[PDB]
Design a binder for these strands. Structure first.
Ligand SMILES: [Mg+2]
Ligand SMILES: [Mg+2]
Lengths: 290, 296
DNA sequence: GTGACATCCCG
DNA sequence: ACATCCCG
């Protein structure tokens, strides 16, 4: 019965997973963006001598150029290029970091968001490695509806470039953290949904928190399926802080990262009512005397 | 490496092929609709004892109810439950028809478009069976962008129901036909995208025709991968008519049908009043079903 | 909640 | 566009 139906094959969705040195993903050929991107983080992965300024954005060679995004779509569009698996999670491997610049990892993102609030969540994930031995993170874009005047719910999103790359309304991140491979403690988990726009330091990460069941219904995905849900799972914002770097800390940490790449860093640093920490002063003198 | 990544598995998109008796589809768990639906038509298949009335729409059992559409999402939505694998194409099997009524084969479709223009395409699909041995149809939904005045391109589609089933702006349909298992005539292929609006009889099917490559880029799909593009493939609107039923033929057909259904003299007496009020010439075939029903 | 089975309407 | 420079 089916040999006749399947004579000329079935339409190909391009849905199959694609693993890389340190991240996997499913690609949406219609939207020219990922559907989901999964990564693993540890204290050792965020340490290394891999440099982001050395990488470059470019289409995933493993993606058929037909349904591939291109830098020509992003540049000048008013939207930035936001990796769903940060380069900063692949300090250990310059290769893994390079694969996170394949445009199959990137979506159109608000500049202030990509560098601001969203960035600070990526930071909060790498922080979880100081308290957890293993941290799994799934990220992806979303195009959610908006009820308006007539009460009709309308999904409305922009598409940029000659290839009409979908610009998402919100971004999501599902953080799964395990204390250790030998601990009896339950797993920490929390879903979050951020709007693709500038967000200040006033809103807390907990405000953008959603339930996993809801994020699955909206994204149409089932996250971490092997994970037993009747088993004991805990809220990551209850076990942990769900605390992002406030303006002071956040501005302090950036300066810590800039000195490695001089006299202007300190000048703008103090102007913003910041007291250079000893951890920053130490790194300052070392780089100052080099 | 992967061992560490996959430790709890990857997220499930639910896009794996789902084969049924006489059709296959890839479901969209987010949009609550199929991405593509692949059916096969033949002379024998459009002929059988299968009757629509016996069937009803219902959520597809194979789909997780979390990502399933429901009749409650459609009823009162202002939209109809339009099937992508038609029931009229599965009249030979009592089960293959019933499976088309799974909401995984359905999209929210304009009432007029579904029983009007879209219908004539599905009729013309079943009409290709006369001129062709085998026919392969791949129909599905679309949410195409629209350019504003300032230059932004925007995808703006509607969502309905508690479960938020997406309402496509357009529907597409790829036709692929073979003359006979015996013959050798190169295959006939055509691709068409139809707005989800009410369409008159004024437009003809060649107007809504787009390239397969174009349809593939817009949909994000590659249709019939095995089919060699280098091979001799024929524009089905050159080897065949690509002719739908005009108003007269179409109005004649429905009138012919509504007779047996009608259960009074007024209705039957009005059916013909519509043809002569619409300037249609009743044919002898209809004069029989009319005069026979008149006796009764 | 849906299988079957009646009833009715429209394009 | 491509090299050199600057944003959050
Ligand atoms: Mg980024
Ligand atoms: Mg229909």
């Amino acid at each position: 019965e089916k040999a006749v139906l399947e004579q000329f094959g079935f339409p190909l969705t391009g849905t199959e997973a694609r693993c890389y040195t340190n991240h996997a993903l499913s690609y949406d050929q219609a939207k020219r963006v990922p559907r989901w991107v999964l990564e693993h983080i540890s204290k050792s992965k965020i340490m290394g001598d891999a440099d982001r300024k050395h990488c470059k954005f470019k289409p995933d060679p493993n993606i058929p150029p037909t349904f591939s995004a291109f830098n020509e779509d992003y540049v000048g569009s008013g939207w930035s290029r936001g990796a769903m698996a940060p380069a900063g999670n692949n300090k250990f491997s310059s290769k893994a970091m390079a694969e996170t610049f394949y445009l199959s990892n990137i979506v159109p993102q608000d500049f202030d968001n990509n560098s601001g609030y969203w960035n600070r969540i990526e930071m909060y994930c790498r922080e979880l490695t100081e308290r957890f031995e293993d941290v799994w993170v799934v990220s992806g874009p979303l195009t959610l509806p908006q009820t308006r005047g007539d009460g009709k719910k309308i999904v409305s999103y922009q598409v940029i470039g000659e290839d009409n790359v979908a610009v998402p309304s919100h971004l999501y991140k599902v953080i799964l953290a395990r204390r250790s491979s030998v601990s009896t403690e339950p797993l920490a988990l929390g879903a979050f949904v951020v709007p693709n726009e500038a967000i200040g330091f006033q809103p807390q990460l907990t405000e953008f928190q959603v339930s996993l069941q809801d994020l699955e219904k909206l994204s149409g995905l089932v996250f971490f399926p092997h994970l037993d849900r009747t088993s004991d799972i805990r809220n990551i914002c209850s076990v942990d802080t769900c605390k992002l770097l406030d303006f002071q800390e956040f501005t302090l940490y950036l300066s810590t990262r800039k000195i490695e790449g001089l006299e202007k860093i300190m000048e703008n640093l103090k102007n913003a009512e910041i007291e250079p920490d000893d951890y920053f002063m130490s790194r300052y003198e070392k780089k100052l005397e080099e």
